[PDB]
Amino acid sequence: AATLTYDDIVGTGLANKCPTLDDTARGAYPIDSSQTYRIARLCLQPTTFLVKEEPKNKRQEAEFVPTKLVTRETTSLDQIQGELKVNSDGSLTFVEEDGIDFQPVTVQMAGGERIPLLFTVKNLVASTQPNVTSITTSTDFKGEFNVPSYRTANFLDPKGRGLASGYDSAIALPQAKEEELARANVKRFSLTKGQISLNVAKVDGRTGEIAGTFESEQLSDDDMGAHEPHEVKIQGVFYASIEPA
Amino acid sequence: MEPNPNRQPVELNRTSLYLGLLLILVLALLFSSYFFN
Amino acid sequence: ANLWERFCNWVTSTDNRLYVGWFGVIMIPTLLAATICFVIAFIAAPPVDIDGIREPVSGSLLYGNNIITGAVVPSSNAIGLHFYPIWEAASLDEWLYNGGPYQLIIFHFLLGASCYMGRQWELSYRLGMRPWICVAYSAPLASAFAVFLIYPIGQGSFSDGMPLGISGTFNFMIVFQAEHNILMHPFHQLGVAGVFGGALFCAMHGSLVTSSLIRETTETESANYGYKFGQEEETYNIVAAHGYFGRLIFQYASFNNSRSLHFFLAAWPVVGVWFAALGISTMAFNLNGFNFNHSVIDAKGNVINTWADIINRANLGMEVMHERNAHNFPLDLA
Amino acid sequence: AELTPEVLTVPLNSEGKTITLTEKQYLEGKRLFQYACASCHVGGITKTNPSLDLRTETLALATPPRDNIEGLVDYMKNPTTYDGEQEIAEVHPSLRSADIFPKMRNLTEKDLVAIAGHILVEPKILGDKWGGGKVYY
Amino acid sequence: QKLGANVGSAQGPTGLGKYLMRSPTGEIIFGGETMRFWDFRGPWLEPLRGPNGLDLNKIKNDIQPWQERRAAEYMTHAPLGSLNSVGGVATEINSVNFVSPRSWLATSHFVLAFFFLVGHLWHAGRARAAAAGFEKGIDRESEPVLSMPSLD
Amino acid sequence: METITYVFIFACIIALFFFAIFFREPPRIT
Amino acid sequence: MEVNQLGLIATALFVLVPSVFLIILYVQTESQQKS
């Protein structure tokens, strides 16, 4: 049925969607602890980006609030692959190796504030509960990943300033005092941690394919140290193909 | 259009100009302090 | 008369203060849409990711621009030549981020201005004039086509269309020079001859007719009152003007035929500007200015610079700095 | 300044022997380099891999050494990576791959010597411009 | 990638993929400024294309030397060059005598199409005027505007 | 204040266009 | 001294708008025809 080509897909939006499994896919994929495994394809399709509002002094409980995506259907992570280790307590650990494992995303808050982020699972290491003798709809994976700077080190600001390139001062204000401009002149490269949960909702025990929902938390862009990042929560759907390797 | 019959010329004589300018300048001289505050 | 007949009579009426006409039926709505969007965008639009690198450029007055720096910013390089109407965006916020106003404005404008040209033909026909004013207008029109449509087509993106703004215009010029060495292209050179010469001949015609106005007024009134709208008699003495100009240069370099003069006045700027437009429209497909980089070499093979090589150094400056975060590979191929 | 016999004298091999090219050989070398090579190697750079240039000092540190006529002639027959480790005729013009790089089909041994002489002579003339890229234009 | 780069995961300076990114509808496309050209299709590139666009496994494992050759050939014969047929960017030095036939054909035909539009306008406007009888000018004794009401 | 000033000048220009067109001194033949 | 930064233009317009109005009315009165 179907087996769609690039010409069937192109311009539809389907290329930014993860594969799904139909409602009958509620089985169990057995894990032989003597066998090595891989995830051949991990795909993450975000459906909501929430940004933690930043409250006034109060120390009220700040809420994550909805946002509008402005960068179009360019948000999914896909073609990710890595080792799926069977650990000595029967837990599984996915160690991400490679793939299209980041997307820059810009979402807009009520009132217009734009929040860029590097939506990612770079260097993901995620583990299940112990004694996972079959992957089932009770399985989940929880783990951590790295969130490098949204811009890399060559990036030049609008006045030509950068970390690995560019001017190191505000050359249009040749005799300004340098101290109040230090935070804009001295570029810094952020590297922080993010956290993710994958909740399996569907398993085809025959094919090694699983799908479900995810929720990830990470920091947004800090503009190479010029401002504080926001906290972002990403929710969506995922698909993975598990294989003996 | 035939002309409008309700039109009238307007006048301001010199004395009125001087009276008017005195009013405006003095009011300014009075209110300017409050405008600068 | 029936309704359609009456409507047609009104549309084509020679008595409307502003002529409508069939061209005008398309022109009026498209120009109004382009104008209203431009005004609102120029005032209030948020920053636009012109280069598709999530680096939004602020064009509007409310977002930190003045009249000189302000612009409506071209649509995103991510879009390229794709058609991006409002209804292809998930929201107006997205539409705005991606530079949707630019496309709406330039497409409505180019359609409307094309109909402005048609309308010039149309009214000339209704009034029993000769038909070619519209042909003179084809010169600026072609130039607007070149910078808003043809150049984008050639380069594969509306992101390389001229921005709708004063500084934006200069950016387009400097990058065009880097990429095409336009100054060294004979069609831009013809364009310069066209506008410098149009200005020269404008001043010359104005000065010569003004020189030769017939005395009809006194020293305490404007000489302009010496001409009355619709008088039958010419108001200057062309024989005197020719007498003057023919001695300034020599006799056979001066026009004694007003028709021939006024034709030259039309043709010189129009033809030059057509070549300007064709310069932009052909550099659109990267047939560029003359390249004499290292053309002069000594007996050993040392490069002996000429002024072309100095131009080249300036061009290099422009090239290496423009869109400083957009290139990942060594050659700028579009 | 002139294109002298001294300028036109370049290393033949790694063992100290030189060859003095004629002015006709220099001109042929330029023509042939333009014909077969300059689409990638204009001005001594490499457009499809700017990390490797045709500077004499770079060629000297290649394996085997390419800073002489014999090394360059051999390169045009059986090109290798910079460390000598892989044969790259399938992706680099050579006599060996003249089937897939048809401009190589008409090049004679004489022609390879001329191209080689051009690569060695040109930096003697142009200095840092040779392999310098746009910075030195 | 031959040098060891993981090209799917390589983040460029802007945060977009240095080599690979998504089109606005999600298809995997080449990055850099060529993002504008993702609608391009050609026989040397299509073998790398999957249902969702450029396929990372095909990229990592299936690129043939003929494809490398062809891409190198085409990159270095891009249709850019001067009026005197110096190939390359406008700042390139003399060396390569090249202007693409595509540039010659597109520019010539633009010029000709343009002047033909001008000729269309010239002759259509003249045909109209001649048919109606005023192509030589306005009759002094029957000037149409003189019979029309004033605009104001 | 800057933005207001720019927009104000522009809006005056637009009003001027209106008056210059619709409330011009009408041209009269002799 | 930290004065209100709009006082200058407020004062200038306060003087100029009504003064101009009166000057306009006076001059066009003088230019009218006499008896």
Add this chain to the structure above:
Amino acid sequence: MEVNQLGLIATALFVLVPSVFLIILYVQTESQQK
């Protein structure tokens, strides 16, 4: 934005002084006998 704080009054008077001049001259022209 840190603009010149005299730009407003400079702009206002640049417009108003010559504009007033012209309006005065126009209106007194109209009020002359026809």
Add this chain to the structure above:
Amino acid sequence: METLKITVYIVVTFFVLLFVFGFLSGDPARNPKRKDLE
């Protein structure tokens, strides 16, 4: 967005039909001299 698209489509079609039918409505005869050009 769907409603906007349809609205604009209808607007554009309306004006284009006026342009075409208008020029089809005896346009050569709408001039001040010779009208029998058919």
Add this chain to the structure above:
Amino acid sequence: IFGIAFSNKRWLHFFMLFVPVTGLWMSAIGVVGLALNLRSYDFISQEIRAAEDPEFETFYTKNLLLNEGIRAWMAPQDQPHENFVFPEEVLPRGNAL
């Protein structure tokens, strides 16, 4: 067509003198200022904002980057009496190019 039109031929032909003559005269005044480097180079408000806010970008800021390229890349050959030597590493360049 346009809403206004000439009605006075003497005015028309005077205006044809005035426009290009006045334009040229204005351009000359500017060049007299450039004799002294008294330029319209910058908008100070723009520079204050951009120096403090690395996300703020206009076509005005973009053009100055082009200008900085022009100066660095052209000066050594265009001004030989200054004996400028600008090492590769100091030359302003964007990514790749």
Add this chain to the structure above:
Amino acid sequence: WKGHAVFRNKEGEELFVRRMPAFFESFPVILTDKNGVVKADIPFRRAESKYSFEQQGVTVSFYGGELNGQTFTDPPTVKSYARKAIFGEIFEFDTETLNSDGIFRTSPRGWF
């Protein structure tokens, strides 16, 4: 006056900052030996830098003025002074009193 700045590299050779010509709104920071040979700079691209103040161990010592007898070796400070040396002799300024914006203006000689 802060005093006269003398730059030196790790070998102890005196280096000289290239001064800004009046034409230039901005100018790079390049230091040469007495013969004009480049010895240190502030790089734009870092990846192939060979003359950085860090690499060359550039120091600055002051003679005369408020900084007389002082030497600075930390690269950020030495660079700061090199940036000012392009303007010639180095001065301490009060920028607070007039809310000065750091951008050069002409004198009455210019305006006249």
Add this chain to the structure above:
Amino acid sequence: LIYPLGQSSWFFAPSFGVAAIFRFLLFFQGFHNWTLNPFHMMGVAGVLG
């Protein structure tokens, strides 16, 4: 005359030549930002006008 007389020398006047004049334009952009100058802009408007 005036321009070079304010500058260091006649060196910086325009050289009498087609390419030389082009170099003078590009010099004025890069060093003077002359496009930004309202007096040049009034020039442009008079020439194009």
Add this chain to the structure above:
Amino acid sequence: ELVNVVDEKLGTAYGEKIDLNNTNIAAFIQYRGLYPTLAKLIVKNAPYESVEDVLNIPGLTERQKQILRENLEHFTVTEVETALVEGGDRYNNGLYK
């Protein structure tokens, strides 16, 4: 207290030698025999606690080991700098000619 980490690194051995943990891969072109084969292996198996650990890359031929031995004097190691190794920058750092 804000520091540019790349400038700072230029004051370490990273500024003097090929840093096996940080330097971009084109730098291996400086010495005979290292590029592209060994260069790829080195970058791929980084980081190293000491320069000599480069000799323990699995699968090296005897020839490769001797080439590495001959070039240890041109190598160093310093702590991995995120700014220099992110973005695939060790394979392509946005510099061409």
